[PDB]
């Protein structure tokens, strides 16, 4: 899946076209297209957990904007797809409208219409022989939930309670007929495991980025690398999980063990559960692995380096404002203002010429 | 709720879902790496008998047809896989695949871990298996199936699906633009081919005419006599089912046009009969060689081909004698693939020229065996 | 189907509700509950030809106007619906906005997705096979014609080029367990004609006014029964061409022969085709008829009385003029104006107060 | 394109689409004027041997399911209608028609000016036909087809029907909210009754059930002794194809029960037993009543009740014993309806009360029995 980053280019043209405007691209591997399909939607890093709707069901014009994306194409279309669906529109309907093979539509309306079943059945209406339907598709505990009406935490403690879990099977460019020594792998629903985790050595967990974007570029990826070659180097057990097609993070030979998957708590949890490392690193991958270092720690996860805790010192305002005020350091005039009025009072408090953070 | 279920010798359990006919099937389990040509495969008379499990896990996204039949009719005992598409879409299309599957009463199971299934015979080597797809399968009586089975090694086969009486084929190949062709008039064909079924597939025949070849197509059994008395260009030794037993009929009848100077070409099967009738040995491979990604070697350009394969069987390269020369061999496993006689105009390829499905890289091989047949009727 | 009237009532809530608005209806039979419906469309004295659109395919806004009209039913609902399945809406989809059983729903589908062919493969794609499955559809000539680009005329001698006509049914109260000596009937497209018209006897046939509107009353009708039953007194076959099931026109005791059907070109010519009357009376049932008047009578109907140029030397303005003038008779000053600055000049002429007739 | 035809012994031709099974079907033509019903018609046995036509167009628009089955399995020979529905649209159910026609592999036609076809069976009285579905149905055959045929006009149907070994029936009618009830316990019900199976639908069973009795479903050849040996509370005869012959089996049995006082109640065929049994003549009728409207004349009350009927053959009235008296007529023809023996406690009656389907109007004939039991229970 492409990753695009409009909303920094307002004034841009942002229809999808010949010439091409995206900055990254994500890549999943799934045991079934829907698997894959939602696995990649959720590693986006766009804040999808996968089909999450864009117009609402009562909107008495989302037909209308749903056909516009639909006849020409967005970075949102995927989207709007499941969309055009939960509002009636035939498979038929949007094959002449985007073009796109009945194959795959068919494909996110059947996900579309089990979605809907959870939201009739609510939390209760997942039995274990259900959820597993549900995840052997791709679908994310985080999607469930909101479907649900739950935490993400809440479905993830049920999979725990029906000892549902992911089995992680592995690349090796034959579809079985050899045996392989690489462990290149992914996870799905299935039965046998083959991840068969070491229980030898001292094993670092390095988080990537996921696809790149304007400001989570290929610096990120380059860290990375760096601190598995580094630490393996040292002997350590080096695994890589990360979901970007296009760096050397995701180069088979840059670590000891890689996990092609979404950098994701749901995803990432479960990796560790099964490999159970001595730390992990979350300040390398950029914004992506870092808004996940509070979760995983207390979920459990053995968080190396500067701790999250830290981290958010650092990045909230009012944790670092004051740190800085304890120091004794200069930083410039501040203020939070809720109201325009008020504002405009602080303003001349502050001085004029301002910077205007949301 | 539609149940299935798989069940191996060892007792290795499969449940699934039902696609195809209601009942049981069982048979020897294999797997096949293709990840195009599934109907194809499943009309392949060398799949008699056998288990079909597909590595690619949409299996049917493009429907169905006849033009993609490569025999009179579905040959595979049971068909495994993971997963079974909703629609199929095709312009070709003219059947889904479940629809076809019962209609070919074939009993079939998705939503198996087919990984785990090809990882178990890859480590384990092939094994015999019974599904059972059905209101409520029963475990034990599958596993019985299972055990009971007699099995493949030390069956003849191709007896089973050899045609009664003889017959004429005239048939070229399949053009996106026109299709499968009409049969061609005998007085359009130079050459005269005699063709052994021993569960032939229709590629095979129709690539033949393509180059010339007016066929005579005849039963397993047929004598070498009856056959001399045809005055063919060449004999050919279709593929089939299991492998031949240095006692049976055609061995003796081969050895005569060995005496000949009649050209003689042999695939797959016919390979190994070719070769047995040459005075080596064939042997049963652990789990075989069933996909179309296959690399081979023609030891004599060294060259590469991508080959198709589908066979159990295999020749030792051990045991050669010496009018038998190596031509090709799998880059894969170094196992044999080709041969030529010294002596005589025989050669046979372990592979599938004719592919369908597969690569068409060892097409060439038909070109040989015109050159022989041209060279023959020069003399 | 009902027959309303809101463009009589401007500032009206045009929505249906539990208080009846319809000032009238029109009934159709049909072997088929297809061929029923586009027969009593094609009888509704609205214009309609069958399902004729509403909305254009290339408005973008189509879906939303559409989505109004099914999720709360206005007179035009019927046309909404089929306009829904030609923009790409699911019978699942129209179900949930409209509570219309999907029996029905998937019916005028079909009828859609047939409509479809027709404009694909245009008149010449009319073969007989083709075009009688059409008929045997309940599709008028007029609506075919539309499709294909052509007069109805066209379609109309494509059918006597195949000598594609309908059948007569009768109405017996059994379904044909015991005859009858009563002549009610319908057309259909089928094999058996139980018409058998008399050869007998001078027959003079009535036209009714389909459905009664604002204008359009119990009146006309009143005068449609009169005729029949004079003349039928005096001696005559009486033949009543009716859809309207609330009157005295449609009851089968009025006259000798009642033909239950759609007051149209195409019906009519039909009925007299085989019945070959002696003379056609179209005088009497209001507009409808009064409409009908050239095309029967250039199509080789004895119409009678009145004549249909007559009829139109007064209804048509230019005609009419002339003649007061011949007769040297008193008329309102008048002009027919173009544009707007042309009126207020001859307007002018004219004086106020204005009369603006369009 | 999926064609199917219809001829007539008098070489009448139907031609439309196929809707069911693959085939021929061979039997006398009936038209029926429900219409709501149609599947329990189609599983009615008294409908067997014979192909039936339905005068209402739209025919499958509820599509299936189980409890509106009146047998074991459909009975019509083949089916005839003027028009499938796209889709079946009802809460209950569970097949749309055509898969079920196909299920029980019956040959069907849809299409058809059925109109025509029933005026032409109404005017002519009934014919035998042939309705054959296929790539390219012969007419000509299906000509020979249908005038070879034997008929039903002396063919013992009720022996291919009935039952081969006697069993137990309590089960009691559906209802909306529950469905249909699980069958009582045998001390649930205080009556006993036995009753002879000459092809008898579920509903019948079911409302006797429904009022008190417990049953045993007797082989229609069973013989007066071996039941008597029962014991019975009252005896019922059921409704069946054809018609009996003065000679048969089941005449002789009545006639023994009807010189004990044991209460006797025959529906239909049952009825027609019944008057046979007492001396009276059967006449088979010019088409029958077929139909879920016609009108039935209670004499006695002067009342009038619609019925449910489903009968070719019928009891002559002028042949009629003196220890017979008419209870019932028709309003639609006049034909005899019902009769009750002043000798005995042994009533019965042409139509359904049973209905299934058809109105309710005549369900309290099943009271009358009920208090012959219960005062036979009281001496
Ligand atoms: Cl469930
Ligand atoms: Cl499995
Ligand atoms: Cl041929
Ligand atoms: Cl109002
Ligand atoms: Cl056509
Ligand atoms: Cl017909
Ligand atoms: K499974
Ligand atoms: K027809």
């Given at each position: 899946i492409p990753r695009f980053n409009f909303e920094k280019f307002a004034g841009a043209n942002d229809?999808?076209?010949?010439?091409?405007?995206?900055?990254?691209?994500?890549?999943?591997?799934?045991?079934?297209?829907?698997?894959?399909?939602?696995?990649?939607?959720?590693?986006?890093?766009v804040g999808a957990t996968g089909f999450d709707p864009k117009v609402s069901l009562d909107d008495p014009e989302a037909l209308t904007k749903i056909r516009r994306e639909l006849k020409d194409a967005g970075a949102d279309r995927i989207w709007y797809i499941a969309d055009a669906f939960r509002a009636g529109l035939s498979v038929d309907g949007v094959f002449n409208l985007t073009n796109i093979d009945r194959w795959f539509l068919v494909q996110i309306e059947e996900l579309v219409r089990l979605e809907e079943k959870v939201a009739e059945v609510g939390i209760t209406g997942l039995n274990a022989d259900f959820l597993r339907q549900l995840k052997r598709k791709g679908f994310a505990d985080a999607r469930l939930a909101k479907l649900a009406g739950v935490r993400e935490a809440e479905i993830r403690k049920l999979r725990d309670?029906?000892?549902?879990?992911?089995?992680?099977?592995?690349?090796?460019?034959?579809?079985?007929?050899?045996?392989?020594?690489?462990?290149?792998?992914?996870?799905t629903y299935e039965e046998e495991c083959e991840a068969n985790p070491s229980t030898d050595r001292e094993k670092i967990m390095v988080l990537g980025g996921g696809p790149n974007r304007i400001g989570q570029g290929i610096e990120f990826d380059y860290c990375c690398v760096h601190a598995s070659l580094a630490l393996r180097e040292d002997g350590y057990e080096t695994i890589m999980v990360n979901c970007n097609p296009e760096t050397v993070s995701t180069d088979y030979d840059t670590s000891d063990r890689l996990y092609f998957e979404p950098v994701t708590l749901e995803d990432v949890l479960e990796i560790v559960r099964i490999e159970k490392p001595?730390?992990?690193?979350?300040?390398?991958?950029?914004?992506?692995?870092?808004?996940?270092?509070?979760?995983?720690?207390?979920?459990?996860?053995p968080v190396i380096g500067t701790s999250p805790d830290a981290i958010d010192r650092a990045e909230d305002r009012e944790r670092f404002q004051h740190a800085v005020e304890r120091l004794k350091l200069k930083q410039p005039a501040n203020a939070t203002v809720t109201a325009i009025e008020m504002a405009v009072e602080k303003a001349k408090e502050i001085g004029y010429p301002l910077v205007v953070r949301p | 709720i539609k149940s299935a279920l798989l069940v191996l010798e060892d007792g290795t359990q499969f449940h699934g879902r039902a696609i195809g006919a209601t009942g049981?099937?069982?048979?020897?389990?294999?797997?096949?790496?293709?990840?195009?040509?599934?109907?194809?495969?499943?009309?392949?008379?060398?799949?008699?008998?056998?288990?079909?499990?597909?590595?690619?896990?949409?299996?049917?996204?493009?429907?169905?047809?006849?033009?993609?039949?490569?025999?009179?009719?579905?040959?595979?005992?049971?068909?495994?896989?993971r997963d079974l598409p909703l629609i199929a879409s095709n312009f070709r299309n003219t059947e889904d695949l479940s629809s076809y599957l019962k209609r070919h009463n074939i009993v079939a199971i998705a939503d198996i871990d087919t990984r785990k299934l090809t990882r178990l015979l890859r480590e384990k080597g092939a094994q015999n298996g019974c599904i059972i797809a059905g209101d409520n399968p029963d475990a034990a009586?599958?596993?019985?199936?299972?055990?009971?089975?007699?099995?493949?090694?030390?069956?003849?086969?191709?007896?089973?699906?050899?045609?009664?009486?003889?017959?004429?084929?005239?048939?070229?190949?399949?053009?996106?633009?026109?299709?499968?062709?009409?049969?061609?008039?005998?007085?359009?064909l130079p050459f005269h081919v005699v063709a052994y079924d021993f569960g032939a597939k229709r590629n095979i025949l129709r690539m033949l005419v393509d180059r010339g070849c007016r066929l005579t197509i005849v039963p397993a059994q047929t004598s070498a006599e009856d056959v001399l008395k045809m005055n063919p260009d060449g004999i050919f030794l279709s593929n089939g089912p299991g492998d031949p037993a240095?006692?049976?009929?055609?061995?003796?009848?081969?050895?005569?046009?060995?005496?000949?100077?009649?050209?003689?070409?042999?695939?797959?099967?016919?390979?190994?009969?070719?070769?047995?009738?040459?005075?080596?040995?064939?042997?049963?491979?652990?789990?075989?060689?069933?996909?179309?990604?296959?690399?081979?070697?023609?030891?004599?350009?060294?060259?590469?081909?991508?080959?198709?394969?589908?066979?159990?069987?295999?020749?030792?390269?051990?045991?050669?004698?010496?009018?038998?020369?190596?031509?090709?061999?799998?880059?894969?496993?170094?196992?044999?693939?080709?041969?030529?006689?010294?002596?005589?105009?025989?050669?046979?390829?372990?592979?599938?020229?004719?592919?369908?499905?597969?690569?068409?890289?060892?097409?060439?091989?038909?070109?040989?065996?015109?050159?022989?047949?041209?060279?023959?009727?020069?003399?």
């Open positions: 229809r999808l076209t010949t010439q091409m405007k995206s900055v990254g691209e994500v890549m999943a591997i799934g045991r079934t297209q829907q698997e894959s399909l939602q696995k990649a939607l959720r590693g986006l890093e309670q029906y000892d549902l879990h992911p089995v992680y099977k592995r690349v090796d460019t034959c579809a079985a007929e050899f045996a392989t020594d690489t462990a290149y792998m992914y996870s001595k730390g992990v690193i979350v300040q390398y991958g950029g914004q992506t692995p870092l808004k996940l270092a509070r979760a995983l720690e207390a979920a459990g996860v | 049981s099937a069982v048979g020897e389990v294999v797997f096949n790496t293709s990840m195009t040509g599934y109907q194809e495969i499943l009309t392949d008379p060398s799949y008699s008998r056998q288990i079909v499990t597909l590595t690619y896990p949409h299996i049917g996204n493009v429907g169905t047809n006849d033009a993609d039949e490569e025999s009179s009719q579905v040959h595979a005992q049971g068909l495994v896989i009586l599958a596993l019985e199936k299972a055990r009971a089975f007699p099995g493949l090694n030390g069956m003849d086969l191709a007896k089973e699906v050899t045609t009664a009486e003889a017959y004429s084929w005239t048939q070229g190949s399949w053009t996106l633009t026109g299709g499968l062709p009409e049969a061609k008039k005998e007085d359009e240095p006692d049976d009929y055609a061995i003796t009848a081969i050895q005569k046009f060995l005496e000949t100077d009649i050209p003689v070409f042999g695939i797959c099967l016919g390979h190994q009969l070719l070769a047995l009738a040459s005075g080596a040995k064939t042997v049963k491979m652990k789990f075989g060689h069933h996909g179309g990604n296959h690399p081979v070697k023609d030891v004599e350009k060294n060259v590469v081909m991508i080959t198709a394969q589908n066979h159990g069987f295999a020749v030792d390269e051990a045991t050669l004698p010496a009018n038998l020369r190596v031509t090709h061999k799998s880059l894969f496993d170094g196992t044999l693939q080709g041969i030529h006689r010294t002596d005589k105009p025989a050669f046979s390829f372990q592979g599938h020229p004719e592919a369908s499905p597969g690569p068409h890289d060892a097409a060439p091989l038909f070109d040989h065996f015109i050159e022989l047949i041209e060279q023959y009727r020069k003399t």
